[model samples]
Target: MKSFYHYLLKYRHPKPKDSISEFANQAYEDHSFPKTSTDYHEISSYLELNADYLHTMATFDEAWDQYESEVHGRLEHHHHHH
Candidate 1:
C-alpha cells in the first residue's frame, strides 16, 4: 500500500536495527512526506499518490505510527526541558 525520520545517520554500515528505523531515516532524508502535517491519512495519501516508496502499505503504515510519535516525543521533550 504505502511505507516509511531520524538522526540522519544511525549507521552507514550493517544497516538499521529494524525496517521501520531504516525506512524512517530515508523518508526524512528524501523529504518524501509533508513534514508540515501530522495527520496520518493526510500524509499517507501524499506518499501513495506521489510515489511508491515502500513495497507494502501495512509496513509503511506501521513505520509511520512509530516514526511520528518517536520524533514528536523527542522534539517535545527538548522544548520543555530547558
Candidate 2:
C-alpha cells in the first residue's frame, strides 16, 4: 500500500507541527499492522525515502534543518515532509 506517510509527504509541509501531525497519525496506524510480516519494514522504508519524513526520526533540530537546506532549500518553509 502507498501508505498515508507517502501521501502526507506529498501534501504537507516539512515542519514539526505540520507533516509531523500526519506522520504521528500514520505511526499510530502503523502499530496496528501485523509486525510479523514485512509490513513494518516496508511502511517504515516509505517514510525514510523522503528526506523530511526521514529527518523526523532524528532527535535534533539540525538533522531536519540540514535536510531541509540540502534537499528542499534554505528559504522555503514548506514541502511534502515525506
Candidate 3:
C-alpha cells in the first residue's frame, strides 16, 4: 500500500471553525496526485500487472487504455478549456 502526505498549516488555534475552514482551504491547496507521466505510467502498469482486473494480457491492455484515457482527460481538461 502507498500513502500520500500534504503539508497544511491548517491551524494552531482554539477556534475549531476557523481551523476547519483553514483545513478545507489547505485541502484544496495541498491536494495532489502523482503528477508526472512516468509516475502515472508506472503506477498504472503496476496495477495492471498485479491487480485482479488485469489477470489476462488482453485485460492488461484494456486497463492501461482506460488509465490513459483518464489521464488524457484530466490533462486536457486543464490544458484546453478555452
Candidate 4:
C-alpha cells in the first residue's frame, strides 16, 4: 500500500513537525496505523473522525479522480488471481 506509506512518510520520524508531520504525529500517537493496511478507509475513517484533516480531504478529492484518470486506464488482459 504505497499510498498509505506515502501519506505516512510525508509526516513521520525525526524531521520537524512543521507541516504534515504535525498531523502525522497525532495520527501516530492515536493509532500509529500500520503501513501494511490495504484499505483506504483505515486512514480515511481515522482521519474522518478528526476534524483537523477534513479540509485537507477536499484537496485529495481532486487527486482521487485525477490520479484515477491517469492510473485507472489499465489493460484488460488480466483477471483476479489468488
- List model 3 lDDT by residue over 1-82, tens digit each: 1121121132322343643333334334433423222344564564465444243445334534554565555556665667
Candidate 1 Cα deviation (angstroms), residue 8:
9.2
**What would the TM-scores of all predictions be?**
0.49, 0.27, 0.27, 0.40
lDDT of 4 by residue, 1-82 (tens): 2554455555565664444445555556655565556455565665566676675665434434443443463453345442
Q: CA lDDT, every prediction?
A: 0.54, 0.47, 0.39, 0.52
What is the alpha-carbon lDDT for the whole of candidate 2? 0.47
Clashes of each: 4, 1, 0, 0
- Model 3 alpha-carbon miss at residue 48, Å: 12
Q: Which residue pairs come into collision in candidate 1? A: 1-57, 2-57, 3-60, 5-24
RMSD of each: 7.3, 13.6, 12.9, 8.0
* Residues 1-82, model 2: lDDT tens digits: 3343343345343443654455545554555443343344564565576575576654223333433455457455566664
Candidate 1: regions farther than 4 A off: 1-14, 54-56, 67-82
Cα lDDT tens digits, model 1, 35-58, are 444567775676677455545466
- Model 4 Cα shift for residue 45 (angstroms): 1.2
**Weakest 10 consecutive residues of candidate 1 by summed lDDT:** 1-10
